[PDB]
Amino acid sequence: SPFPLTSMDKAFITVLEMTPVLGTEIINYRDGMGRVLAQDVYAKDNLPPFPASVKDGYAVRAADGPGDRFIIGESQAGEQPTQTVMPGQVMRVTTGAPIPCGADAVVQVEDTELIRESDDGTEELEVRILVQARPGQDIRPIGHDIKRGECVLAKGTHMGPSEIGLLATVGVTEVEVNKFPVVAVMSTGNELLNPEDDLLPGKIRDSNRSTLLATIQEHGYPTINLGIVGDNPDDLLNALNEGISRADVIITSGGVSMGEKDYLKQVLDIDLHAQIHFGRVFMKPGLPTTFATLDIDGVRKIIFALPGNPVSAVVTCNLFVVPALRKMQGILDPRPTIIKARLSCDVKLDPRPEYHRCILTWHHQEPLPWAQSTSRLMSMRSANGLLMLPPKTEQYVELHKGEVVDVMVIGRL
Amino acid sequence: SPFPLTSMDKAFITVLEMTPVLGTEIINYRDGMGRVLAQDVYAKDNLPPFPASVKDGYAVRAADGPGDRFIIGESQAGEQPTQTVMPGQVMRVTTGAPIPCGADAVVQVEDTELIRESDDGTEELEVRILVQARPGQDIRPIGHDIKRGECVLAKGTHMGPSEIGLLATVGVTEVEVNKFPVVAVMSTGNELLNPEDDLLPGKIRDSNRSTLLATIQEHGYPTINLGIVGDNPDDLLNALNEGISRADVIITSGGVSMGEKDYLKQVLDIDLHAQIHFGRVFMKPGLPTTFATLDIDGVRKIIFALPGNPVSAVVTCNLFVVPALRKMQGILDPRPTIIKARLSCDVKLDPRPEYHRCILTWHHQEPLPWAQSTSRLMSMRSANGLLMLPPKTEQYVELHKGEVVDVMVIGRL
Ligand SMILES: Nc1ncnc2c1ncn2[C@@H]1O[C@H](COP(=O)(O)OP(=O)(O)O)[C@@H](O)[C@H]1O
Ligand SMILES: Nc1ncnc2c1ncn2[C@@H]1O[C@H](COP(=O)(O)OP(=O)(O)O)[C@@H](O)[C@H]1O
Ligand SMILES: CO[C@H]1O[C@@H]2O[C@@]3(C)CC[C@H]4[C@H](C)CC[C@@H]([C@H]1C)[C@@]24OO3
Ligand SMILES: CO[C@H]1O[C@@H]2O[C@@]3(C)CC[C@H]4[C@H](C)CC[C@@H]([C@H]1C)[C@@]24OO3
Ligand SMILES: [Ca+2]
Ligand SMILES: [Ca+2]
Ligand SMILES: [Ca+2]
Ligand SMILES: [Ca+2]
Ligand code: NA
Ligand code: NA
């Protein structure tokens, strides 16, 4: 128009406020990594479901005290005992085996001495108990860890390996979760060739599509590759319509500044009738970043039209797209983690808030990491942070090596 | 035997020293996430491959100075111009378009005023240049960003999205990388049922297999599910032989303490003829953790026999297995990231170094994160750290809330 310069705060809040939460589906628990539960999950059994030994040793009567005992048998892991321990008797137990009737404590083998075994040294017959056990010692009573009827996982839980293991424990193998967003990515520009092409005069290879798709995939979301689209409104409209049909989220790059052949914003508004919430952001890089929604058939589609410059595209993808995707897949607080780190070099501040990929490194002595902006060993590592520099003011015009700055985590630390 | 209590330092060093690096394979660049390059990668083209405009504006002769100029045409993105700019002339350019012959600078449109356009307002004819440009301004010369013949990625680089984008840029779509390890996981114990089973007397559901497989999958490595194996040497040997055939790494859990039906270490030594490098570790939890190698047909197989206790299994998997897998897939320094964090509560120290899953959280004010050991909102989050508590000494017997401790990162922050 030009569109108003939207502040970074307002643009980010607008993305989260306008992005929908996807519907739910039932999945197998093994497919639950990174999913958010849409239901509370309850145990239908006690854990342990029988009183269970914590130790290799003997199930005893605490009231017998220390002394010499006849071993009446062994409680085997996986088998309910049938014998009752009576005074002067014990039963051998292993870790995880059930406690027999008549015993109220376990004495670990280290607190015993063997007296007699069968001539074939395969059976223990008599043992000396060297300690006074307390009732209940080294036994997990029924339900000690989980009780039947207990809610073991709450709706809203963002699951990792231990939550999957908990579902396995309680036998809840099918769970309701939010869907993951399907994200379509297209590149735009008459100068672009595919990565697989040799160069032709006036042309370059499309890198943004690969970088953006890889970024989305790294977060676990399914993607659709919509290819390269030329700088013309008909082709852009057709590609957007395909994205809308096939995906929940459409990411484009290129064609969002005010250039003679930058058509995306016109197509979004005039042809698609999408609502453009912002078309410029007061940020460096990323000035022409554009965010639109399209409500069709009771469904809200999300469209990010990112800048064409490759660094701008990947930075703005991490700032705006990834948090939106996290909200869509049901994460209750979708904001990225921000950590404090020390600047590795002096920096002159821009009037705009400025963002730069960096590598966070901890030195085993120092409490704060260093942020090295993108060495023989550092060239081996991928960026895992986005430095977040404050706007310059009449007071603060520069920051110095060692000073503390905010860094958004964008990769595995 | 019992096996010697191996110090944590020695056990960890032994794992890394004895673990092999896998062989290489050629992959498509799109499949490169998390891979390590086994070759240097070179650009075969310049970037840009033509002198490219940084701006929407006009390609000018700097020597003409400011003034009124005839527009002789437009350089289009993706098209080599054919006209030569002569004195008193300019050519319209867009960002990324080639600079025509005869021009040596770009003046952005904001530093100009239009004089005349065609009656049909679709063609600019005459423009006022308001600034004195410097030769080269707002042009990326050929090779400014990447030069033909330049090494753009070194062998040993652990690739993320931006490295994939760089491969796309230079058109190197096939790259040599280290293989990922195939990791087989089995559970052991006569008391175990599958997650899909209803409980039977004396039995519990196998959770370790799910938790361990999910942990490995979270790191991107292919897995093989070897199921549940009973406490008997024949079945254990057969399952290990299947793992050895199908996988690079075999993980078991259970059956590694000194109990009457704990057979794994006997099978590994006597039947498989594997070399057990350690069979106990002075750590809490994880005392019976076992690490073995098996050299067969010039190939080194890796076997981790982890403790059966579910918390021990997941802790020891993160401490020993994940670093080994990182070395196998070619990461040069496979050690996890260790960060400094503040303890959320007082802790009594054990004679053994102690490890506990926790959640790291940053508060937007404070420089160090807090480590909360595994709240309405915190129950929504998965563990992302492993607290690393030091052994007790005659001097240090306890640590207090707020004191700084080491935390190993085990999840996305
Ligand atoms: N997919 C892409 N891969 C690599 N470079 C790109 C890609 N798309 C655009 N570019 C380049 O980025 C720069 C800006 O492109 P442009 O389409 O003008 O972005 P915008 O108009 O959104 O600011 C140009 O140099 C252009 O060639
Ligand atoms: N896969 C599993 N899932 C859940 N619990 C398990 C699993 N394997 C073993 N356990 C339990 O862990 C505890 C220790 O098992 P055990 O086989 O004695 O380990 P180890 O001998 O290696 O110390 C027992 O209570 C046992 O039932
Ligand atoms: C409202 O926008 C402000 O908060 C936001 O939330 C968080 C918690 C998360 C990171 C970051 C968000 C990605 C962009 C906006 C900035 C700030 C400008 C951001 O910083 O910190
Ligand atoms: C040699 O073992 C010591 O260093 C190791 O390396 C690092 C850098 C990485 C984490 C951790 C490793 C997983 C276990 C051993 C500890 C220590 C006991 C560990 O701490 O810090
Ligand atoms: Ca363009
Ligand atoms: Ca443009
Ligand atoms: Ca067992
Ligand atoms: Ca055991
Ligand atoms: Na930009
Ligand atoms: Na253990």
Swiss-Prot record, chains A, B:
It is found in: Postsynaptic cell membrane; Cell membrane; Cytoplasm, Cytosol; Cytoplasm, Cytoskeleton. Inhibited by copper and tungsten. One of its GO terms (biological process) is molybdopterin cofactor biosynthetic process. Changing residue 390 to A: Loss of GLRB binding. Residues 1-413 are annotated as: MPT adenylyltransferase. Phosphorylated. One of its GO terms (molecular function) is signaling receptor binding. It is a lipid-anchor. It catalyses: molybdopterin + ATP + H(+) = adenylyl-molybdopterin + diphosphate; adenylyl-molybdopterin + molybdate = Mo-molybdopterin + AMP + H(+). Pathway: Cofactor biosynthesis; molybdopterin biosynthesis. Its cofactor is Mg(2+). Keywords: ATP-binding, Cell membrane, Cell projection, Cytoplasm, Cytoskeleton, Lipoprotein, Magnesium, Membrane, Metal-binding, Molybdenum, Molybdenum cofactor biosynthesis, Multifunctional enzyme, Nucleotide-binding, Palmitate, Phosphoprotein, Postsynaptic cell membrane, Synapse, Transferase. It comes from the Eukaryota. One of its GO terms (cellular component) is dendritic spine. Expressed in tissues including spinal cord, brain, liver, kidney and lung. Its EC number is 2.7.7.75, 2.10.1.1. Microtubule-associated protein involved in membrane protein-cytoskeleton interactions. It is thought to anchor the inhibitory glycine receptor (GLYR) to subsynaptic microtubules. Acts as a major instructive molecule at inhibitory synapses, where it also clusters GABA type A receptors. Homotrimer, homodimer and homooligomer. Interacts with SRGAP2 (via SH3 domain). Interacts with GLRB. Interacts with GABARAP. Interacts with GABRA3. GABRA3 and GLRB occupy overlapping binding sites. Interacts with ARHGAP32; IQSEC3, INSYN1 and INSYN2A. In the N-terminal section; belongs to the MoaB/Mog family. In the C-terminal section; belongs to the MoeA family. This is Gephyrin. It comes from Rattus norvegicus (Rat). The gene is Gphn. The chain holds residues 351 to 768 of 768 of the full protein.
